[model samples]
Structures are given as C-alpha cells and as structure tokens.
Target: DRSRVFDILSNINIGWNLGNTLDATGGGNSVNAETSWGNPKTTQEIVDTVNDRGFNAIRIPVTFANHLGPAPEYTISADWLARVKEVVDYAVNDGMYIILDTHHETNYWLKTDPNNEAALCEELAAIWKQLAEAFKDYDEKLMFEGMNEPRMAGSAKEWSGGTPAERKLINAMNKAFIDAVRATGGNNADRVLIICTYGHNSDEPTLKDLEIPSDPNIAVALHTYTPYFFTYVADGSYSVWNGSKKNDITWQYNNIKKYLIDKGIPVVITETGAQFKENTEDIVRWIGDYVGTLDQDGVKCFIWDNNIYHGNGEKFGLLNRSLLKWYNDDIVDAYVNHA
Candidate 1:
C-alpha cells in the first residue's frame, strides 16, 4: 500500500494552495486575476482542471482561526468545516490524493502563546479529533499534516530547544496530536500523517531529532523555498531568479533523500515553488530539472500551487485564468510524464 502511494506521489506534478484571504489580497485590495490565490470558483472546477492537466495530487492549506472562534478553546464553525471537507471530497472522489493542512490557523495556537502549552495541546487535540471523525472513511491518500511549520522560540539557544526541558514540551505537544488523531478509529487510525520539524520546517538539524511515531503510514514532511529573498521577494522582474546563486540541485537531492532513506522514513516535499514574477522559462527549467533529479532518486515532489495568486505583480501560476491556457506547457509536461 505504501508503495502504491510512493508511485502516486512520485507521479503527482500539480498542486494548489487553498490560501486564505490574506493570500488572496496579495498585499492589496484589488483582485489581481493572476495574483489572487484562490479561484473563488467551485472545488469541482479546481479538481477538473488538475486532473485534466495530469496532476495527481492536491494540497489544501486552510486557516481555521478566523472560521473558528478565539483562543485556547477555539471552536470551528460547522459550515466552515463542511465547506473544507466538500472541497477535499471533490478531489478525493476524482481519485486524486489530497493533503489537508492547517496553514495560518494553527500558528496562533502553536506560536503566540507558548506559555499555555497544556491549553494549546488540548486545543490541537480537539481540532484533530473533530477532523479525524469527520473524514474517518477517507483512505491513506487523505493525509493529515499535523502542522504547516513549527518555529522555535525567540533566542538562538532556543533554536531547536536544545535542552531536554525545551525538547520535551515540543515533543509532548506533537505526540498528543498524533494520539488524538489515532484515537478516532477509522481510516484515520491507519491513515498517513505528515509531521513537521521545528524552526519553520527548514531546520534539517531539528528535523533529524524528530521522533516519528511507529506508524508505517507516517511520512516526515518538509517545506523548502530556499533563499527566501529570491523565492518570495515580490517584483515583476526576474532579478531574484537571475541574481540568485544556483546551488547544485543534485546536492539537495543527495542530502534530503539520504536523510529520509537512511532513517527508513518516507519524505514529502509538501511545498516547493519559485516566485511568480520571475522568468517563467528559467523557473520552469529549474523545477523541471529538480523534478528530473528527484525522479532518479525515487523521491516525491509537490508544486506550491495550481492557481496564480498573491504574487502581486509577480506571476507564479502555470495556468493563466484569464488566458485559460497553460502558461508553460512544456515545463508542465516535463514533470507530468517525468521527462
């Protein structure tokens, strides 16, 4: 079963970010067709577009904080919860694997109030319990990524919470989340769960310390957008894309793949994308080249998004909604067929 997933995950090429209003705003009030994060259309439309384009996976990053009421006892609105499930079901029914992630919403519980660790853990548990119960029947493809990115405390000494006192609290919180989801017996009991490393999911050292539960279905997850200035620096020009120094993409494969394979754990590149406004051709080439490299190594990758939004003036989407045509078919095809 895990092998089947590896095949599906490896083949998956397109993914979308169901970003919140903040993402949609793109630093402005205007709805920039090529800058808005979501289509404001139906879920079926998004799914149909992805399947039509030969994409096998969809990652829905949602924020429940606004939808869910305030504080340690945040309560998610039933309507909001149902809406998210409906979108997920639309894709799942289409035979596409979906990763349901808590993006901005969970940050509040995990980051803002570190003092209320117990309350935070309880709230986190409650949320997962509700979600697991809601989508109990969904199979392995519908994975639950515990959190989007877990960051460390303010100081350097707290980089990964080096001491036992720090590590223990973080570990306990994570363990509680895993136990809560597993408690809801169903497909969820055996479903795959993706766990993130502390320090924005980018600290390889911290990720190395992560103790993934003894569940064969679990896969350690990471999000990479290296040299953030180049990846997200908003500008219409391709300066960042061109000015940035290129590291050996193969080196990245060797380091990350070796870590996962050495540990006997499956890995997922949950988020990977270049800035939207940069040179489409160059960005596409980089992505295509990276995918090619990962393919050879038997690793899996998921693009950051399907729709172009929040890029401000920077164009990042493969599909131009207004144009209603793929912005870069050649690059897309390269990964679609693993060229």
Candidate 2:
C-alpha cells in the first residue's frame, strides 16, 4: 500500500543536484539542445551514496526541450525517456523519494517575450504528458516539480499583475502540469506535485501572492541564501560577517513559514548553502545560527549542491567531485541530524 503521504512527507528530507547529467548544456532556439552526461559513474552509484548519507529524497532536474519536438508537436526522444527512467528507478528501488524537475527547458519558454508563452506551455504539457505516461506505475515516492527557477519575466508588472497575477500563473501552470500527469492513469494520478513562486527567491512579498491549488498533495518550494550578495561574493573573498543582519535570516524564515502555515501549505527550502571559501569558524557560527533558526521554526532544507563548479562566486557544494565529503561536517551534521 502507498504510505500515508503526510507521514513520508513530514520527514526532513535532504537532496543534491546530479546536474549536467540529464539536461542540456546551453540555451538554443530549437529543442535539440538537451543532452545527458551519462555520467562517469552509474546512477546506482549516486543513489547508494545518497541513501548512505541519510538523504531520503533526490531532485533530478532535466532539460527536455532538445529531446522534444522541433516545433508544434514537441515530440520527446525515446532515448531520453529511457535514460531518465533508469535514474528514477535507481532511486525508488533504493527506497528514496524523487522529485523530477523541468529545469532549463522552462526558462526558454517563460522569458519576457509573449511570443514564447503559448509554445512553451504546449511543449511543457507535451513533456509532462510523456513523463506521466512513462512513470505512471511508480508510487507516490516519486513526485513532479513543474519547473525550476523559472526566470525571465523581468518585473511584477511584466509577469504577474500585482502579485496575484504571479500566483495565478503558478496555480494555472501547476494545475495544467498536474492534469497532464493525471490523465496518464496510474499511481502518478495521486503523486505529490511541487510548485514554485514567481521570484524563485520565495521572499514574503512573492509568496503572499501565491495561490496554491486545492490539491492536498501540493507543496510550496523556495530557495534561500541569506545576505545574497555576500553569500555569493567571490572566493578567496573575505567579507565581514555582520551579526546585525540576524533579522534578515529570521524574517525570511518567519515570513515564509507563516505564509505557508496559514495557507495549509507544506514548505521545502529547496536550496540553501554558503560558499566553499566561507569554511572558516566564523562562517560556521553564522551558518549554525541561521540553521538553528530554521530548526526552531520547523523548516526542511537541502544544501546547494553535491558537486563543484568554477566561477568568481560560485563555490557551493557539500561534497567535492570525488564525493569523499569535504564540508564543515560539524555544522552540516548539526543541521542535518539536528544535533
């Protein structure tokens, strides 16, 4: 039997990005841009590590446009479907819940240009339809996230009218995606679906305008990183840490929590972690305080990443590429194990 949704749902689940694996590398005008890493290691290898680390969920973000139709029909590649299924099976077979996400693909369509909206929605629907049909037999442990970090609509005026327009869009998009999946006729009909807010930042203002569908299985997701500018400041970059900004962290949690709770919506901190260079004791202390706040208020968070990438300010990962585990273990343990 399917486990009670809330029982499995309430647990504080953690996840990491197996990025660059099942998605396109860059943006393109046509759908053929999507590619898979077919990574150096097998999917099972990744799943085993996740399970060993006490992570109960995996978020696999894929870029499907390249594999979908050239224009109108938006056909999905059978090869891509098989590869994704292999990864999903690896997780579920190991008893880990999975969240399949539409990543780069959505960004292409959600741009400010109105010309892209209709085609984007059609392509999105087609992709979800194929996905729903493919994974229809999978249990509730597998969930679907409509899109990841959908940005492009520059301002509130451009996209959501006031904030209500943003909420309406999210509601409509999620409902459309859910309906597409449900039409497949299988366990997917009841699987939980996570929806994102307009800003992708999930600040109070944006979430306040969020109108989640009536589906009890729906959960609201947000990404958080405090002192955004500094947190993303360049590496080898020493920036003064200020305690005065404590309220910044607190306000974010409280405001977001209140919004979700009042609306009877479950929440997930989909992404949160500091820079690699911020590995100092001072940084640890600040992170601890921030995480303590989240714990006190009952929030579920997943760190920024599992692998490393290079950039002036992009050093975010809990484990190095070797996957040998190389972050501040004490702080991570404190938050993850709630020590």
Candidate 3:
C-alpha cells in the first residue's frame, strides 16, 4: 500500500492552491490564462513570496480542456504545457511540494455520463499520459492530482457525490489516470499520484464507494468546505467563531479518519477553506481549529485561495499577488504559524 507515502503527505504541514489562475478555462489556452482571472501573473517572485511564508506545499490547479487537440490522443499544447512547467519550476526550485491537476473539467468535457464512459476514460488517460511523459524525470517533490472535483456541474446530486453511476465512472477515471501515469516510466514510475472520490466528497457513503487503485504510489484526495452553510454562507451568521464551531471541523476530520486514515490508507484534504466573510478576527480562530484538527489526524490540507480577498465572491483571499502582501495578517498568521 501507500503506507510510506502517507508519512510524506502528512509532512505537507499546510498547502495553498493557485486557484482561478491556470485553472481559468475562459481564456482558452493562452499564457495570459494565469492572469486571466482577477489575480496577476504567477512569477518566481510570487512563488518565492509564498514560499517565504514557510508553507511547504503549493497546489497548482490547471484546466486542460480548451488546450487539448482532437480526440484519440487529445494532445496538450506544448506552449501551454511549457508555461505550466515554468510556473512549476518556480516551486521545484524552492523545493516546495507542488500539486498539479486538471481543474474544472466539468465545464468542458469531463462529463460523468455513463453512456460516454469509454470516450471519457480514453480522453482522461490521454491527458495524463502526456503530462506524465512531460514530467517523467521530475523528482518526488512534485505530485500530480488526477482532477479537481470531478462531478456533474448542475446535476441534482452534484454535492452529494452524484448518483451511483456517476460515482462509478469517477472511479474508472481515477484508475485510468493512475494506470497511464505509471506506464510513462522514468521518475513517474514511482511518482506520488493523487486520486479522488466522487467530486472529492467526504461523506461516508460516497467515500465508501471509491475503489482506490492497487498502486502503492497513490493517495486519496478530498475537498471539504465543511458545514457549507458556514463557509459559503452570505448571511454572516457564522461570522463569530466559538467552541460550538469546533465540532464542525472535528466531526469532518473524524469521519475521514474512520474511512481512510484509520484504515491504513493515506488521505489528503487537497482543498478546504472558509470564505473571507469580513471575519478575519474569527477566521484566524477558525484556521487554528480547522487545520489543527486535521493535522492531529495526519491529514494535510491546502486552503482555497481564489484571490478575491476584499472585492467580493468567496473572498478567501489571503495574499494580494499583485502587491505581494497578505490581505489579512491575523488570518494568514494563523495558518502559516500554526501549520
């Protein structure tokens, strides 16, 4: 099993995701896609600044949907791949743990349709085979996450891990990704690969259905904006943190422990965060309790930073990439310091 890899995942103290940047599919396949969103371009300076905060890990989400060629092979654009590799280099140079993954494919072709399962699986395998071959020589510091929340965008069971058919297709997709990468040889032969359950959902029933591949280099990936009411609530009722909120996070981690960790399988909270609801003071308290709970359980997490700190949206912005400053000192300190 991936027993030895679990120790490596636990060592990732805390992680930050470069969301909405490379993962932005609206701009198609341009290098500007990195800055296509509200955030500025990712550079060595920016990567260095993030590394300066002492975070040992960085998760870079990328959407290759618009960058792929025709079917059969679904070749990734060399230029687009090069641009990503350049950004990855910034982290690899600093020796940071980096997670690269296909982001928001639900918006494009990652349909969980059972009727088209064969084509879907073929495309997924093609994409990773290209990625694995490209980074085949890379070291263990780099990790490849199969996908970022693979699910039907507006389906009835979207958040609930979709229907049984959808979940089953997701499992097959994960297997294709793992199998393709391992066949690439070189360093990729032993590379740490991340696989996800349906939509990366953490619910017991949904998680129980996931069939992890037999590969020992793979670990499970999960995303939790746990107690969605609090994290995504627009009302600000949960703005004030207290002892009662402790159970919100504790319960989630405990569930994962019961399903994955306690079972000798490695689990990674690839994405989790509370939106910046003008509660920096309280958010600081939340991160301490949030990350601390998972930390104790040997589960590593990466906070979702979409770079919308003050303006609007999910406002989980911790760093101002353009100005290179953290928007919320108290909250940032809670994660960086406690982690």
lDDT of 2 by residue, 65-163 (tens): 666656666777777678788888998888887888887654455552333455556666778888888988898788888877665555644333224
lDDT of 3 by residue, 85-173 (tens): 99999999999999999998888998789778889888989999999999988898799999888988889988888888888888899
Task: Give, for candidate 1, the lowest lDDT window spanning 10 residues.
Answer: 25-34
Which candidate would rank higher by lDDT, 1 or 2?
2
- Number of residue pairs clashing in candidate 3, backbone atoms closer than 3 angstroms, sequence gap of 3 or more or interchain: 0
Most TM-score-accurate candidate: 3
lDDT per prediction? 0.62, 0.65, 0.84
- TM-score against native, each model: 0.80, 0.83, 0.96
lDDT per residue, candidate 1, 204-225, as tens digits? 4555566666666677676666
Error of 2 at 85 (Å): 1.6
Worst ten in a row by lDDT for model 2: 30-39
Candidate 2 CA-lDDT value:
0.65
**Top lDDT: which candidate number?**
3
Model 3: pairs clashing at backbone N, Cα or C within 3 Å: none
Considering lDDT, which of the candidate structures 2 and 3 is the better prediction for this target?
3
CA lDDT, candidate 3, residue 261: 85
